[PDB]
Amino acid sequence: ANTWRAFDGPGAHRALSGAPISFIHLLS
Predict the structure, then answer these.
(1) Under 8 Å CB-to-CB from 5, ≥6 apart: which residues?
(2) H-helix or E-strand spanning residue 10
(3) Rounded distance between C-alpha atoms, residue 23 and residue 19, angstroms
């Protein structure tokens, strides 16, 4: 989660309120 986000496009707080890494795991 931290490795790919920091290199291209670092948007930590804006994604966590809407749909981040954690929202994707609920569907599978």
Answers:
(1) 11, 12
(2) none
(3) 5
